[model samples]
Target: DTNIVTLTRFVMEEGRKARGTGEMTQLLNSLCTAVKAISTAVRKAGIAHLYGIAGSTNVTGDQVKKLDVLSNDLVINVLKSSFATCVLVSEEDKNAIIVEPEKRGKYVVCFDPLDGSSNIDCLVSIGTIFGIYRKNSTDEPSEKDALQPGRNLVAAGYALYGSATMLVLAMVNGVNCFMLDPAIGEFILVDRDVKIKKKGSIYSINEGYAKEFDPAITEYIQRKKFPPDNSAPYGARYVGSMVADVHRTLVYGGIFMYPANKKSPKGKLRLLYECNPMAYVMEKAGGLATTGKEAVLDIVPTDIHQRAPIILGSPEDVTELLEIYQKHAAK
Candidate 1:
């Protein structure tokens, strides 16, 4: 028997039952709809001249692509209409946005609207990462409300636009994956309660600037390629896009790392918008996430666009990375 559960139906029926909040279900459903909209525009962006620069630099100093603005607007519009968004923050925005404060919204959303936009020209995989947090019942929408640690995230997810678009979600219960059925124009649940394996056969990172990495990371990369025993070396796979790489690590056992370097000493990926969301998903999937110093979810955000070095994936792989870091720390 084929289980044909539409995303909206799943949210209204199953997701709502599990989430325990009608507002969360509606907000999540709205986000899915917005992601679907972005997916369609992404598909036609090249020919529609939506692939070039937007003639602006984001708060992070990265060039914003036309699709970035479109995707950001799509999310913000949906959130505003949902009437549940107290605060909304995007990587493209310099400050957090307060929507319908009069409605006394109960949640805050932070997101990277269109990650890896530079790859738009090459048609490589790019994605969006979003995290939802419950606002304090007594307070109004404020930047302070959005400055939460990843541990406080009530829900998180990523929409990966690759050869096939996938929406991977994480909530209190567990992790689930939905595939977009373009023919039916809905996301259908495919993988439910996903769990990542403890060991992995792949490692992802940028080695082009190997000289810029810390001694611990550089040594680990070398050891990763050349094992002490006669064991086969791990295969290397890295897509410059964080979501694409992290999604691959989530589905298949592997480790994806973005450590701080000379160019950006504090690291590149945004803490609230990117790392926190991915950490939420990765951890709930029975995987591990860390920043070489501490758990990714433990880091409290001081700024909306705070950056962090992220290393996450299979448990054993993450443990090994930690061991290497510890080995150098004690020296």
Candidate 2:
């Protein structure tokens, strides 16, 4: 019998001792409920009438799928009901939704409802990513409250729905992981205080942009595979999903980079939805994240749907990439 402590227990007991907040427990509980609902839909996507595109495009111009909308609604609705949210920013909404405008809560949330939603019917792993920040000054929660950088985060996490469902969370203390037990209907602790390796031989990137990449990125790759035909080759792994890719990089040791290219010079991934949360978890796990030039969490968000280039994972790998990036910049 694996009677390990549950996620709720950790949030209530350990989290309270570490962070001195019960509102975090409330917000996390709400997040769990929302993630579970999305998980159900993701698991039964074929028959739940959740398949097919929603016939619209999101603020970022990606085709919105039915599940994207559904998942967004589910997360927003759950947070609203949990009475733990003041303002919620989602990839699906044009602006932050003011929840409990009467001032009932102290946290602001930002999330991607269904990351890699195109894979909804493709049977690949997709997930939900969320970051939480506590309201400052006790003023009515505004878009400004949600605009704080990742360093100000009170909590951050993601729920990966795959062959097995897992929830990875991080507070000031460190990173913790939980697995869903279908029979028990609860997330049981699987790994506590997770840390990432300092360097890894595996590298995850979309090399289609090899030509589009900054010379440094291209040179980095070339040098990895053939630094004069005698260098040790790094393994290449890409799953077409940020969550899946970063998850692997987090577990094993590696680097995941989404850089500015010719076509999308500004980069593609949303700062709030994708980069910040991953950066939080990565940094907490002894890894580092950056926008090729600066810390990912240090960038102040200028827009609700702002995008950024991200490089995160093993510290040594990150440092290597950044040195090359800086080297190219100086040229």
Candidate 3:
């Protein structure tokens, strides 16, 4: 009875804006199919015996879960069959998967098939992060095609599996959030042109690793907890899952930080899979994303699974954190 915009309709409309053929629309449709499949599997994980580690490490050296492998396969197969992708890079694989020349499309996709796998068994909110870039040339698809900077992303998004499945998407125009309807098996647009606040009173990070953080991050968190102005302290909330934390930050407004520490100087989150896609989403939503020193989108990835420190969220909060990094560097 009411007007409703499904993801299929939304992608087609978006494609029209770019004066594109049906390639982008088809690509997004394939992505939606993959996410839907994962969502169903995640919900049935307990009964289907989909929990537990797979006794293998992914390219990033993280212990892979049964669900991770399944999710990765779902995404890879769906995308490959769409005929809309030239190369695919996934967190679960060591190398990029190049499409056959006959089936190759103009897009390259980098994805974390199953993020927050650490909380999978616990039924915590986990997600899939993906970034899509247009191919540089019509030449043969190679690893180089998948190593684009975040700034080159044509579209980016994440599929959150929680109490309800949500797909948060970012295109050049803006960011939008869609909720999956189990009854209809479709993602319906719920929030349009989503935007983050300029400032917020919450900070998301792993305080357990505080001792190993750099001086800049130490000072930054300290200031948030005990502001020099003696104002109310910012609340601390870390879900241990980047997707959950970032989703909360996006809706409620706050800062989410993962900085380089003594234990991992290059940071933990992958540049292509985790950081870039989320950065594109946040930046498109009027927020800021950086590695303290440089914009997250500007960094050129050297490896398919390269990791990096990421600090992103409300503009004012992120800018303050950057100032602290500058002060620490000057000394």
Best by lDDT: 3
- 1-331: candidate 2 lDDT, tens digit per residue: 7566888888898755456547777778878888888888888888888888889877868888999888898999888777677889999998998986653577788999889865677889999999888888676677888888889987898999878889999888899989988776788899999999999888889998887898878988887787566768998998888889898898998999998887776688999979999999999999999988899999889897999999999999999989998887863
- What digit string (tens of lDDT, one per residue) describes model 1 on residues 251-298? 898899898776767778889989999999999999999998799999
State every prediction's TM-score relative to the real structure: 0.96, 0.96, 0.98
Error of 1 at 220 (Å): 1.1
Off by over 4 Å in 1: 1-3, 13-21, 102-104
Q: For each candidate, how many residue pairs have backbone atoms clashing (under 3 Å)?
A: 0, 0, 0
Q: Score residue 279 of candidate 1 by CA lDDT.
A: 95
Q: How many residue pairs of model 1 clash at the backbone?
A: 0
lDDT for 196 (candidate 2): 98
Clashes of 3: 0
lDDT of 3 by residue, 1-331 (tens): 3677998899887777567768888898999999999999999999999999889987747888999999999999999988899899999889999988787788999999999977898899999999999998766789999888999999999999988999999999999999999988889999999999999999999888988999989998899988999999999998888999999999999999999999897789999989999999999999999999999999998898999999999999999999988888863
Q: In lDDT terms, how accurate is model 3?
A: 0.92
User: Looking at candidate 2, what is the lDDT of residue 273?
Assistant: 75
